[PDB]
Design a protein around this ligand. Structure first.
Ligand SMILES: CCCC[C@H](NC(=O)c1cccc(Nc2ccncc2)c1)C(=O)Nc1ccc(OC2CCN(C)CC2)nc1
Ligand SMILES: CCCC[C@H](NC(=O)c1cccc(Nc2ccncc2)c1)C(=O)Nc1ccc(OC2CCN(C)CC2)nc1
Ligand SMILES: Nc1ncnc2c1ncn2[C@@H]1O[C@H](C[C@@H](N)CC[C@H](N)C(=O)O)[C@@H](O)[C@H]1O
Ligand SMILES: Nc1ncnc2c1ncn2[C@@H]1O[C@H](C[C@@H](N)CC[C@H](N)C(=O)O)[C@@H](O)[C@H]1O
Ligand SMILES: [Zn+2]
Ligand SMILES: [Zn+2]
Ligand SMILES: [Zn+2]
Ligand SMILES: [Zn+2]
Ligand SMILES: [Zn+2]
Ligand SMILES: [Zn+2]
Ligand SMILES: [Zn+2]
Ligand SMILES: [Zn+2]
Lengths: 271, 270
């Protein structure tokens, strides 16, 4: 079966690069039960704290590559190397909040501390998968620790997430301060909603702050956990809360020799 | 002797650098304000950003037809194929402009996305002979071209009352009344002086939200602008009804409305 290009950009031009769609697997058409949006949206009263005076900000007169940058020290340190990539020593299982520089900082918009706010840079592709529906894969080699894209969607409350019957696209921000908030990319979302779960993941989510510092609304950034070959499927560990829920419905089809949520794994766990 | 005292007053925040020169006196680069590319808030404004309240269009082409609902909201799309306002655009009393948004089915590069696309002409902060700092064009600018947005601090009408230095205060005007104070927070617009014979006009635009209490102020050339010309708009009589007693006008256009000698004619006739 030929692998037919079916959308030259599902992003409709809102990203820095086009995100094309292909299907060389079956006859499913281009997904369109959703609204592609590049940044988070709201559908109820949220009042994100956008007071510019509330912003912690640095006084740097360099490119903010020094350990004296206040933005960095907030982040423990700036975990970005010279090329914008997430340092190898990054506690990539217990990752701390990253505060990027903002509009209150004295530094320039091109400082070393502005990776996530600068948008997608890698060429990605939405494609049809063998046993998982749609997915996202890389069209280039991606060095470890590179920023991929942001988990974008509809900002909703922990209570609103309890009510929603379709939790296939629900990201739990998990607010330590106050109440949990969540991102539901079921009706409004970006390329991130199409990323499948891998028991051997290659991207990780990081909580990030940029143009605001309202702690109920960290933004989710995905970075490569490893070097990634061209054509290879992006996926992150959805977690064990997702799979104790969706265990009655489907099972993991990732195939990994260390797969935790395949039908065999569950049935072998019941003994 | 002209010197360059800043390579980009916006610090890379605009699509193009906005340098500052002075060949007039010893005033260094003004730094008594934070430059911001986009409006900021210093208290809770409760701007309706509910995506489901956006009026949006269903076009798939470039939104150049008359079934573009976002053009209908604006009477018509007033942008020509090159992003410029049509010659027939009501310049005295512009109509509100509703640009296409993130709820539109159209693409981000359609014909109704001028102001949201940012500064494109080359502009320069320079020291004028009499008006402190001004903003001059670095290039020929045809009529209808978007120049810049009036960016600053959103404040209420009551706040604007207790603001002592009202030399950067712009009126949106309305039920509920709000202001843009560019005094403490501003973009390059705060340096555009007043000209009795203006060559730019402000237009109220809506882009990512359609909260009618917070139009964004977009400047467009009301005529062709020659290379080196200073950008100015008509502050209006409200500004000069409180500022003229302190300082008189210096535009010097033959048809000056707030000049020194133009005050004496109305004072002598009346
Ligand atoms: C598109 C798929 C979403 C993935 C998953 N979705 C859900 O679990 C989910 C689903 C439905 C409903 C709700 N929510 C509520 C339900 C009822 N009532 C209330 C709420 C949540 C996810 O969120 N995965 C994930 C993985 C790592 C991570 O990284 C940090 C955390 C761990 N450490 C490693 C530190 C870093 N953060 C998140
Ligand atoms: C440095 C730039 C000043 C601009 C000027 N500022 C002031 O005059 C001003 C000055 C001091 C104080 C306040 N304000 C408050 C005072 C007290 N308490 C509360 C507030 C306002 C301006 O806004 N000019 C303008 C011109 C046309 C226009 O276009 C439409 C509106 C009207 N029509 C004639 C055409 C359509 N819009 C705006
Ligand atoms: N490892 C997996 N094994 C089986 N199905 C998966 C796996 N990961 C994701 N999925 C499927 O994709 C959904 C998660 C979505 N966020 C991903 C996009 C979705 N697959 C789509 O094509 O629209 C899940 O509810 C599953 O239906
Ligand atoms: N036509 C004018 N005649 C005299 N002074 C003007 C005129 N237009 C603007 N100004 C001056 O500039 C102020 C308005 C400012 N927003 C413009 C930038 C200002 N020239 C500056 O150097 O910061 C006024 O309060 C005046 O001090
Ligand atoms: Zn810094
Ligand atoms: Zn900073
Ligand atoms: Zn910085
Ligand atoms: Zn698995
Ligand atoms: Zn349209
Ligand atoms: Zn539209
Ligand atoms: Zn459009
Ligand atoms: Zn004058």
């Amino acid at each position: 079966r030929t692998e037919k290009i079916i959308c030259r950009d599902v992003a409709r031009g809102y990203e820095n690069v086009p995100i094309p769609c292909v299907n060389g697997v079956d006859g499913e058409p281009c997904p369109e039960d959703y609204k592609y949006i590049s940044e988070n949206c709201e559908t109820s009263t949220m009042n994100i704290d956008r007071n510019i005076t509330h912003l912690q900000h640095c006084t740097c007169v360099d490119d903010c590559s020094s350990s004296n940058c206040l933005c960095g020290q907030l982040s423990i340190r700036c975990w970005y190397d010279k090329d914008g990539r997430l340092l190898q020593e990054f506690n990539k299982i217990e990752p701390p909040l990253i505060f990027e520089c903002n509009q209150a900082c004295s530094c320039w918009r091109n400082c070393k501390n502005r990776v996530v706010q600068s948008g997608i840079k890698v060429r990605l592709q939405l494609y049809r998968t063998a046993k998982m529906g749609w997915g996202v894969r890389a069209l280039q080699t991606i060095p470890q620790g590179t920023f991929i894209c942001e988990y974008v969607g509809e900002l909703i409350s922990d209570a609103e997430a309890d009510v929603r019957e379709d939790d296939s696209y629900l990201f739990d921000l998990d607010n330590k301060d106050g109440e949990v908030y969540c991102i539901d990319a079921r009706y409004y979302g970006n390329i991130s909603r199409f990323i499948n779960h891998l028991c051997d993941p290659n991207i990780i989510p990081v909580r990030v702050f940029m143009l605001h510092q309202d702690l109920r609304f960290p933004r989710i950034a995905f970075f490569s956990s490893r070097d990634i070959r061209t054509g290879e499927e992006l996926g992150f560990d959805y977690g064990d809360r997702f799979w104790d829920i969706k265990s009655k419905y489907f099972t993991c089809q990732c195939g990994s020799e260390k797969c935790k949520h395949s039908a065999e794994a569950i049935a072998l766990e019941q003994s």
